[model samples]
Structure formats: structure tokens, C-alpha cells
Target: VRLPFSGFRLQKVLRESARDKIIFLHGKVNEDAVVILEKTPFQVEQVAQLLTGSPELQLQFSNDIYSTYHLFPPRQLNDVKTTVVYPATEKHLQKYLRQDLRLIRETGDDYRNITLPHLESQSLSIQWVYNILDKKAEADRIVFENPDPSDGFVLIPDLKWNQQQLDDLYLIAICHRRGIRSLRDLTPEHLPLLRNILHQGQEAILQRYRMKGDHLRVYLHYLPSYYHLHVHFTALGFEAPGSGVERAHLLAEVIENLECDPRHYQQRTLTFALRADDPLLKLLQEAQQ
Candidate 1:
């Protein structure tokens, strides 16, 4: 595999979360817009070795070692943003934990027809997705692509996957058709796109990775991380992220529902869970009031 890291040129910083020890960078590599997410290494065995090898300063209070500090290279220091959380409290960790989950069931008509200003405002910028669709980014990572404008999609491994492990394999099939935001937007008209993904996506994976159709978990996520009509393909045995019943809907089941009723998604009520602090949840609460 060719590494694009050396050619990356930073365009902007999308986000920086000291609490999560991660940063999201938007950049370009040879004119292709790309997003790079860098995370601090976890405290694993390798980290333990580095921690004990040498220290610029070591403070000892009693027989046990309290804290040790190490100096990073100037280039390395410049690349990352770090904050010292001296005397960290429970409140510091709370933001990283799952917030209070509340289920909201919305009738299909309500979801399709309601005009919630706050929810509309919360829609994330999907320029990155467009970049991929336009063949301007992640071109090298494309495992499969069907250029047909109507019933085509681009299949690529999700960033979360290491691409080395089959046990926890994860891939995404992003539809070419625009304006279809989420599962709520599905109708009988989208059967061709959905069916193409269900079959071609599986065939491509089997041809490349040798994974059978039965071992794959093909589904779509409600309240998806991004507002693009993308389906997730993961190893069935792996509990891939966002596979929870509260969000994921099986593609096969969705197809069957659409077949049974031309407007299945348009008429059926959808239930999903949201974090207490989610902006959408706040809008929902205000709507209730």
C-alpha cells in the first residue's frame, strides 16, 4: 500500500478534542482533498516500555514513582495539541462516557414533514463526502466503484478499520445519488440503488477479501455520523461501532419493507436513541414543550 502521509498538505483543522486525545485535519494530497484523523497512542504495552525507558524529570514521593515527564521532538510537538489535566476530576471523564440515552419514536409522517429549525441547522457539512463522490479524494482507497449516476456507489473501507483484520472488518458503500440524506428518505424509487449495493458490495468483498455473504452484516445507520446515504458492511461476528439496534437497520430488511409497501419508510414510525446532550435531542425536547 502506498502511504499518502508524506504528500499531505494541511488545508485546515476540522476539530481538536483534548479530552478525546484526537484531532481531525482536512488537507490535500496531490490535489485530492482528504481528511486525516490523528489520535494519541493508547497506554498499551509499547507505551509502557517508552514510559519506563527514560525520563527528563522524575518525581518520587515515597517508594513508588509518582510521575515522569519526557520531552518530545520539536516536529512531533508541533504536530499535536496537548493539554495538561492536572488534578483531573470525574467531570473531566464524563464527557467521554456515554450520556443519558433517550429513545424518540417519530411517525414517518412526522419525520418526513416536520420542520424543526434547530435540527435543520445541525446538519453537518458533507463537503468531504462530495470530494469522494467527485473522485477528488480517497481515490486510491476505493475498493470498488460503479460510476452509474442512478444506481451506483463507491465502496471503501471505513477509517476505523485497520484493513489488516478480517474478524472486525468494516466497509462503507456511499451512494452516488445526492439529496437522499438518511434511511428516512428511502422509498420504492431507491430499490435499484439499494439492491445494487446489497449485491455488488458483497460480491466485491468476497472477490477481494474472501469473506462470504453470510458472514457480512449489511445495514444502514439512522442519525448517521454524516448526512450521506451510506450503507455499512461489517463482519457479522464483530460488534462494529454504531451497529446497535437503536440506530442500525438491516439492508435486507429495509429492502423487504420497501417491497411490501411502496412507502414503507414514509409511513412506518422510526425509533432511535440519542444522547441527552445531543443538539438534536435538545431540539426534540423543545418541540415537546
Candidate 2:
């Protein structure tokens, strides 16, 4: 665990040091370190080159990188401040989320305090943001969202959604808010939106397991609103067996149960058609098996 601050702005480093802030107590790869120091108004990576050396180190703060491609290949030094990190493994990587990713914000500012946990001792836990292939990672993953923000699908009492659903919802909301309309190319800024814990109660602790399905414990990016509970199922052998089709059948049962309850959305037009063969879409076709 090496806490490398080789690329951060001297002013930011000084600010953190002034507050006795050490990114890592020891030298752990994935520890939560929050700093609200926006030492530079420009991109950190470009700023890093101006202060540091050539062959600059790029820092990904927000989602503005999509248009900043013109700023790359730093022609001069001190172009921007770039924070460099190397996570241990791919399986353990913290997604490289870009910046400005969120629906609502805190007074709507560019900087804030964010803490990221799960500091794996070793493995591809962190890596250079530029080298990361985000979409490649989410290729097989499913993203979720709540059609109505006021519906409270994030809570168990209202929508039976688990940590997985919450995570997907958080990502979708954050992305939609940040103008990140792509599948891959994530950044730490993106993670911050979901990693946040909003409302909760003391009893029945509402937390996300943060699992990989096959990862030790499923992690919930956001704590469920005191009104609901969302538990993420990660990588593991501790889940119901069966592939896409089997899971679809089980979900159908849940939907049927919901329908039988009161038909609040009685015969409401579903998104899927009976002619649809996609397993997940089976729910769209309500008249067929």
C-alpha cells in the first residue's frame, strides 16, 4: 500500500497536510480520502504537467474529459494537476468514473469531500485512469433506473429493490445528470454519487452488501432511504441457481404476486410484448407464459 501524491498540486498537498490529512493511515490502495481542495480551476492532469515533468500524468476529476480530448498530449509543463494511482487487480479495480456525475448536488459546486473504502492489500485495485476500459468491464453488467424519482423504488417497503438495484439506479441517475450517456468510461467522480449515504434509521441498519455475485460481500453504493432497504447481490455461490431464463421465471412470480395484491396498475401497458423472446423482457408480455 503506497499512498502516492506525486501528481497532486502543491497547494492541495499543503491544504491536506495543514489539516493533518493523510490519504492513507498506512499505505492501503483503496481507502476513503476526502479533500475539498480545488487548488486548480483547470484539469488536474494538465496542471500536473506544468508543475511536474513531461509525459504528464492525467487526473480524471469529472465527465468533461469527453470534450477535453484536445487538451491531451500536453505541449507544455504545468498544464494541469494529474493524480496518479495503480490499483492492484482488474477484479478489484475501483471504476474510473469521470467528473460532474450527479442529478442533485450540494449547492452545486465543483469540489466536495468524498471518502472511498475497500482498500484491497493487493490486486488491480487502482490504476491509471486513462488506461482503464470501463465499458469493457460493464459489457455484461445490467444498469437499472427508477422511472419516477418520487416513487422511492430505492426502498424495500415501496419497491422491493436490493443493493444491486440501488447501485444501478444511482449510476443511471448520476450519469443522466452528468451528461455521461455512454456505456463504459467511468470515473471516480461517478462512484462518489452512488457511494453517498443519504437517509437511514438506527434500527434494521439499511446497507448494501457490495458483492461481485461470484466479491465477498455485496456493497451498496447508497444507503437505502429510511423508508426502504436495498441489498446488492455480488459474485458468490450464495444465490439462487439458474441462468437468465430461470431468473426470469422467478421474477414473473414476484410480478404476479404484486398484480394480485390490488391491480393498482391493472392491465397497465407493460414495456415488453408477448412476441418478445428476451428473457428479461418476458415481463413486457403479460398475456403469455
Worst 10-residue lDDT window, candidate 1: 80-89
The parts of candidate 2 lying over 4 Å away from their true place are 1-185, 197-216, 219-289
TM-score of 1: 0.66
For model 1, residues 87-173, the per-residue Cα lDDT tens digits are 224454333344557888767645654523444766579998999889999999999988888899999988889887898999999
Off by over 4 Å in 1: 1-95, 113-117, 285-289
lDDT of 2: 0.26
Clashing pairs in 1: none
lDDT of 2 at 39: 25
The TM-score values for the models, in the order shown, are: 0.66, 0.16
lDDT at position 28, candidate 1: 57
Candidate number with greatest TM-score? 1
lDDT of each: 0.76, 0.26
